[PDB]
Amino acid sequence: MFITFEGIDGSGKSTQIQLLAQYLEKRGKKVILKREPGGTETGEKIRKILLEEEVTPKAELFLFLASRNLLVTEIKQYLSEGYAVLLDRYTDSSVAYQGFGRNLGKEIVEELNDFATDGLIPDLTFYIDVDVETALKRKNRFEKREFLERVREGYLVLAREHPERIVVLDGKRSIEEIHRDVVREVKRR
Amino acid sequence: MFITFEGIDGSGKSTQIQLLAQYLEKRGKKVILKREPGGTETGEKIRKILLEEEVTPKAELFLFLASRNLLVTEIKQYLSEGYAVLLDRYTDSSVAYQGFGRNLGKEIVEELNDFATDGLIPDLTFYIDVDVETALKRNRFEKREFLERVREGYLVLAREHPERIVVLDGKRSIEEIHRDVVRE
Ligand SMILES: Nc1ncnc2c1ncn2[C@@H]1O[C@H](COP(=O)(O)OP(=O)(O)O)[C@@H](O)[C@H]1O
Numbered sequence A: 001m002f003i004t005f006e007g008i009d010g011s012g013k014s015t016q017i018q019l020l021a022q023y024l025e026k027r028g029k030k031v032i033l034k035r036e037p038g039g040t041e042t043g044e045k046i047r048k049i050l051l052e053e054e055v056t057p058k059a060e061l062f063l064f065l066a067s068r069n070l071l072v073t074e075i076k077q078y079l080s081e082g083y084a085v086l087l088d089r090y091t092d093s094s095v096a097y098q099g100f101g102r103n104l105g106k107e108i109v110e111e112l113n114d115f116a117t118d119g120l121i122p123d124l125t126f127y128i129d130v131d132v133e134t135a136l137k138r139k140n141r142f143e144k145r146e147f148l149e150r151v152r153e154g155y156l157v158l159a160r161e162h163p164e165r166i167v168v169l170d171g172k173r174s175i176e177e178i179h180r181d182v183v184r185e186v187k188r189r
Numbered sequence B: 001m002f003i004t005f006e007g008i009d010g011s012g013k014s015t016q017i018q019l020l021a022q023y024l025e026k027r028g029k030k031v032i033l034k035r036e037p038g039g040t041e042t043g044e045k046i047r048k049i050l051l052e053e054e055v056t057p058k059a060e061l062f063l064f065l066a067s068r069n070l071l072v073t074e075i076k077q078y079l080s081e082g083y084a085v086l087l088d089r090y091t092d093s094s095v096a097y098q099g100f101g102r103n104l105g106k107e108i109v110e111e112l113n114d115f116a117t118d119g120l121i122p123d124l125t126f127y128i129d130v131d132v133e134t135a136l137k138r139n140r141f142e143k144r145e146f147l148e149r150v151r152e153g154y155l156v157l158a159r160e161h162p163e164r165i166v167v168l169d170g171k172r173s174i175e176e177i178h179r180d181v182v183r184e
């Protein structure tokens, strides 16, 4: 069970992934919750540079890929041990933020993601959609309005490219409403 | 002008490149010296991580590329201001060390390098060869069998493109080598 949460800043990812972790734990599931960038000792060192320092779009992309490669190395084992792995952001983020947001190109980033993850693809990905103004009012260097609009639109394209994996949630709903939707979709495995 | 030096840890890179600067400073030429990994503020942070931490081959590779794309942007400026760029280690480093040394594939690393460096190829690159024990005599990237692989990687790369890579015998004298480079 490999599930990821995606969406722009302020969409509600961190909140929802935790509510989901509790629900699966209470039901007697071995849950592993991780975030990106970060999730490993060195990945967290990488995360601090990405947030604290300004970098070119390609270097920025390579840093997210390094952190991702390190995180994958660890979670794969968990997955191969009956553990449920929940991730706060994954490959779609690089596609949406660096592919669309920074305009490096959807295809290029996806190919790099493939090399970086050795093909580990989520079974289920919750994309929480919300308009930018709402997200920013409720919610770093990534939160610029225009940038985030391109990101949001990029995520919507991705939802269209992988409808089997990506489940689009309506971020305008209440926190508890969305959680209902989340649990409802999980119930199907 | 864009110059770069390659070769394993202890082949005589820092020594040569300098001696090729104090020569150009001597003849007016405005040169700037940069090294990889590092060369920029964030790059030195990435450098620290690569030397102090244990990372998987790919993370290792992506960290070098991140550092390279940052420096490259800064190098495009100097070769825009008419400067002279002497660089200790570059794309070949990733190919030999990550491609062959880590066995991630020559073409793979080569393509990432293109993407990360926006197709910036050095005019002249000096590959300084030496056996492993000698170099060691003179970090985590220094395990004989690995270096062996890296050396092989450098030589197989020297074959491919003999257009810019000029080999030298680091087992020689510092002045002997120097002279050989001063020519080009
Ligand atoms: N559906 C929601 N309705 C109202 N506020 C929300 C909703 N989801 C999240 N928030 C609030 O927005 C802020 C950031 O949420 P977070 O879960 O941290 O979003 P992300 O992790 O997507 O930035 C918090 O105050 C969170 O409680």
Ligand SMILES: Nc1ncnc2c1ncn2[C@@H]1O[C@H](COP(=O)(O)OP(=O)(O)O)[C@@H](O)[C@H]1O
Pocket (backbone or CB within 6 Å): B007, B008, B009, B010, B011, B012, B013, B014, B015, B016, B138, B169, B170, B171, B172, B173, B174, B175, B177
């Ligand atoms: N041609 C040479 N012959 C003998 N020793 C050399 C030669 N070139 C460099 N050295 C010495 O090898 C050691 C490492 O050289 P360095 O220039 O630091 O190599 P790298 O920069 O490849 O580590 C130093 O003692 C340097 O003076």
Ligand SMILES: Cc1cn([C@H]2C[C@H](O)[C@@H](COP(=O)(O)OP(=O)(O)O)O2)c(=O)[nH]c1=O
Pocket (backbone or CB within 6 Å): A007, A008, A009, A010, A013, A014, A036, A037, A064, A088, A089, A090, A093, A094, A095, A097, A098, A139, A140, A142, A143
């Ligand atoms: C995983 C990933 C994150 N990011 C950015 C998006 C976030 O603004 C930043 C920090 O992630 P997070 O801490 O998840 O930010 P937020 O809680 O506001 O959503 O990382 C990318 O640009 N590319 C990526 O691949």
Ligand SMILES: Cc1cn([C@H]2C[C@H](O)[C@@H](COP(=O)(O)OP(=O)(O)O)O2)c(=O)[nH]c1=O
Pocket (backbone or CB within 6 Å): B007, B008, B009, B010, B013, B014, B036, B037, B064, B088, B089, B090, B093, B094, B095, B097, B098, B139, B141, B142
């Ligand atoms: C630029 C680069 C360096 N390296 C390694 C070479 C060294 O082991 C380490 C530090 O490089 P460097 O400081 O040049 O050390 P040396 O003088 O011994 O050559 O980084 C790679 O593995 N890949 C790369 O792309």
Ligand SMILES: [Mg+2]
Pocket (backbone or CB within 6 Å): A013, A014, A088
């Ligand atoms: Mg969050």
